[PDB]
Structure formats: C-alpha cells, structure tokens
C-alpha cells in the first residue's frame, strides 16, 4: 500500500534523530547537536522522505503509533501538523497511523530515545523522559514550517512547546530552541493578530535561566522579525543591541540576524552598514528552509542599497530569477539615479500598499533625500570644481541655490565628503594625490590584520570540538 514504500525511509529518519538525543545527554557536546539538528536533517526529513516520494501521513506516524500522550501533554502536538482526527490536515495517503491501525513498523526501536511503547506515555520518571519529550517536538516541527500550516494548529503550538518546559537543561533547551524558531516563522506568515511576540518573550525567560547559548541565539533573531511586523520600533532597537549573537551558529541563523539588523539600521540613516549585512544575508541564506524570509531580504535590500547611494545593477534583478516581483523596486532604482523627485513621489504612493507588506514602505519614503543625493554624489566625486549650476541642469533640481543647501547637508552627513566654496560658486572635491604621506594605506592593511587574527582565534577552538564530542560517545 502507500505507507509501505516510505517505510524504509522512516527507519532512516529514526537513525539520525535517536543518536542525536544520545549525544546530548552525556555532558556538553553542544556544537555537534546544533549542526545536525537544523538545515541538514530537516532538508532531508521533509523533502526527500515525505514530498518527493509522496505520503505526508508518515509524520504523526513517526512521533506516535504506540499511543503515547506523554506525562505532560504532547499528544495534541503530534495531531495538529497532520491528521487532526480526520484524513489529512494537509496530505494523508496513509493506511496505518495510530488512528488507522496502530503499529506496522517501529521507528521507536523499543527503547526511549525518540519514542517507546505506551508504558512511557501514561507515566514514566526516567532521565530518558525529558530527553525524548524535547526531541519529539523537533521531529514534528520539521513538516510544520515547510508545508506552511495555519489556523488553530499554529496557535496551540506555543502552549505545548513552552509552559510544559520551564526546567530543561543545556542539552534539552538547545533542542527546544530550534523548535520554537520554526513555529515562529510559520506564525509570522499568516499575519494573525494573535500575538506572536508574547510566547517568544515567555520562552526567553526559560532560555536565560539554563544559560544555554543556543536558546538565546534562536529566539532573539525571531523576536526581531515579529517586532518589524507589528511595527513597534523601540523594543527591537534595544533587543538587537543586547544580542551578542555567537560566532558558532547555524547558517540560516547567520543570514537571518544580519538581515534584521539591516532593516533596523536603514531607517536610522545607518544605511552603509545596513546594505553590507543585507547583501551578505541573501548569499548566506539556503535554497530550501530560508525561502519565505529570503524573498523578503532581496526585495528590501534593493531599496536599502539606494539609501546609501549605491546604484543597483540589472544583473542583481535577473540572476536569482525573481525579476518580475522585483520590477517596482527597479523603477525606484531608475528614479534615484536621475535626480528628479516627481517620478520618485509618484511610484512611492502607487506601489505603497505592496511595499508595506514586505516592510519597505518606511524605508521608501527616506529615498526622497537620496534621489537628489545619489545624483549629486556621482557628479561631485567625478570632477574637481564644478558649478552648482552644472549639478542643477543635469539632475533636474529647482535651483542652483536649492542644490547648494542639499550638498551642504550631505557633506555634514559625510557620504559625499567635500567642502563647498560659494565664492565663484563651485563645489570642491577632497583629494591629496598621494596617500603615502598619510597613514591611510597602513590603516587599511592594519584593519585586515585585526579581522584576520579574529579568524585564527575562532578556528583553533572550533576545530577540535566535534572529534572530542565523538570520543566520549564512542565512534565506529
């Protein structure tokens, strides 16, 4: 039948998860636990096993088929992703589950280390019991975020995943830490008025008491994403500053943090820094899990780069092959370059609704300073002494006098750097025609030397950690 074919792969899924739990339980093996847990296992569990072969009715077959309700409720947790009490909360195509025929296979392998017989479910006290429970939830959450489940299922995730846990450990908190972040993205997507932020805050207190590196990193990045949606600026600003955000973090974590920090910085008139992190973020983000947030980074970033006075290329639009969705941003790119306001104001209002979703709209209005700035910027840098009159004819500014105030303000900001001599009336470039007399070639090299040294210190410590973890746990 249909669940028999995918049965081979369920034993495979169980092999990787069971081991992962095992590792965690013996002291601090933390580094090896987080790489396994996130993009690597997940890309396989969902896509290869369930979707590709077909049969998504192997997910609540995986976390139940014994009839475990667990000593602290998690029976519901398993239902809601798939097979609510009917055939499919998305895709069924299963003739055996725990509400169709109990048992057909054991991914549970008759030992508490993912799942185990009903004897655990009704009551246990074992030290294997928290370890299976935290783990139980990671396995479930994997289909939730990929398939983009919604509704009530989304609302009840939070309850089971935290306020059943307020005591964990470092091993357990790490697993839970990953589960909360995936649910949080699924939550964000629906654009429900029911507070995403509130749960994520409650989860933070538990993260902090165990003092688990992982818990702080995951929650914090999501908490910023939540904050942007509501559009309550002050809290996110403080929260970003508090995040130390560890150097030993998963790839998806790295791309998402830089991305949030960029959104926050862009409105602020810290656009030079915002644009670098946002460009980086797109590259760093994967091909599979990342896709919802990923879209949003490329759309926002095009506006953010303009804010610095960068003129973004056509290759940028064509190459990921999203050019259609990007088409309006493309229009802003043209408008910024020309130096004339009329085209920029018109586009801002017309696409206004579409921009607001992505969270661009607050950044779009800031470009009005930038429309003129980007055009005066090319002209001031290129030439030496040029008249305000040249700037105004080319750019289509109102007056040379108008153009004179505008250049003055920019040199104060210092992203065009010049000194104006309104005698004859030219704007003058800064330039020394030798930078060897100045420290600047040395200072440039020296900065690299600090940046380089950081890589050496990071590498020596990181290198031994996974083989060490493997030694205690025993390797074949």
């Amino acid at each position: 039948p249909a669940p028999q074919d995918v049965e081979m792969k369920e034993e495979a899924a169980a092999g990787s998860g069971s081991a992962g739990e095992g590792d965690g339980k013996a002291a601090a093996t933390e580094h090896s636990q987080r790489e396994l847990d996130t993009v690597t296992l997940e890309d396989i569990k969902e896509h290869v096993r369930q979707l590709e072969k077909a049969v998504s009715g192997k997910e609540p077959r995986f976390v139940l088929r014994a009839l475990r309700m667990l000593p602290s409720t998690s029976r519901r947790l398993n239902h809601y992703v798939l097979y609510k009490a009917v055939h499919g909360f998305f895709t069924s195509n299963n003739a055996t589950r725990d509400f169709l025929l109990p048992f057909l296979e054991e991914p549970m392998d008759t030992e508490a280390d993912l799942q185990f017989r009903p004897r655990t479910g009704k009551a246990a006290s074992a030290p294997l019991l928290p370890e299976v429970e935290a783990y139980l939830q990671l396995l479930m959450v994997i289909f939730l975020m990929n398939s983009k489940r919604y509704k009530e299922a989304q609302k009840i995730s939070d309850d089971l995943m935290q306020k059943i846990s307020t005591q964990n450990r470092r091993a357990l908190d790490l697993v839970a830490a990953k589960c909360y972040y995936y649910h949080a993205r699924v939550y964000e997507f629906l654009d429900k008025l029911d507070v995403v932020r509130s749960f994520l805050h409650a989860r933070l207190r538990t993260a902090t008491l165990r003092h688990d590196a992982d818990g702080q990193a995951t929650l914090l990045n999501l908490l910023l994403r939540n904050y942007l949606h509501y559009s309550l600026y002050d809290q996110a600003e403080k929260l970003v500053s508090k995040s130390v955000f560890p150097e030993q973090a998963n790839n998806n974590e790295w791309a998402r943090y830089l991305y949030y920090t960029g959104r926050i910085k862009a409105i602020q008139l810290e656009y030079s820094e915002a644009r670098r992190t946002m460009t980086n973020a797109l590259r760093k983000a994967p091909q599979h899990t990342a896709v919802g947030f990923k879209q949003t980074v490329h759309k926002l970033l095009i506006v953010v780069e303009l804010l610095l006075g960068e003129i973004p290329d056509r290759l940028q639009f064509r190459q990921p092959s999203l050019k259609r969705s990007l088409m309006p941003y493309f229009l802003l790119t043209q408008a910024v370059r020309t130096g004339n306001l009329a085209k920029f104001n018109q586009v801002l209002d017309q696409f206004g609704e579409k921009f607001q979703t992505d969270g661009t709209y607050t950044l779009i209005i800031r470009l009005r300073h930038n429309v003129i700035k980007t055009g005066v910027r090319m002209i001031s840098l290129s030439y030496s002494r040029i008249s305000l009159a040249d700037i105004a004819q080319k750019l289509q500014l109102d007056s040379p006098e108008d153009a004179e105030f505008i250049v003055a303000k920019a040199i104060r900001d210092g992203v065009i750097e010049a000194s104006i001599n309104h005698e004859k009336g030219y704007v003058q470039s800064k330039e020394m025609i030798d930078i060897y007399s100045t420290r600047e070639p040395q200072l440039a090299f020296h900065q690299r030397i600090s940046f380089c040294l950081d890589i050496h210190n990071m590498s020596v410590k990181a290198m031994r950690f996974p083989p060490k973890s493997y030694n205690k746990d025993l390797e074949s």
Partner: peptide, 24 residues
C-alpha cells in the same frame, strides 16, 4: 542598470564633426 553609453553612440559621432568648429 543599463548603460547610458549605448544611447550615446549615435549622438556622439555626429556631435564631433560640428563641435570642433563651434567651440575652441
């Protein structure tokens, strides 16, 4: 984005012949 130079090709060849006389 697209280079303004292309549009410039047709305009630049013609300009050359006139300009030399017009201005020193």
């Amino acid at each position: 984005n697209v280079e303004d130079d292309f549009s410039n090709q047709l305009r630049a060849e013609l300009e050359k012949h006139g300009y030399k006389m017009e201005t020193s």
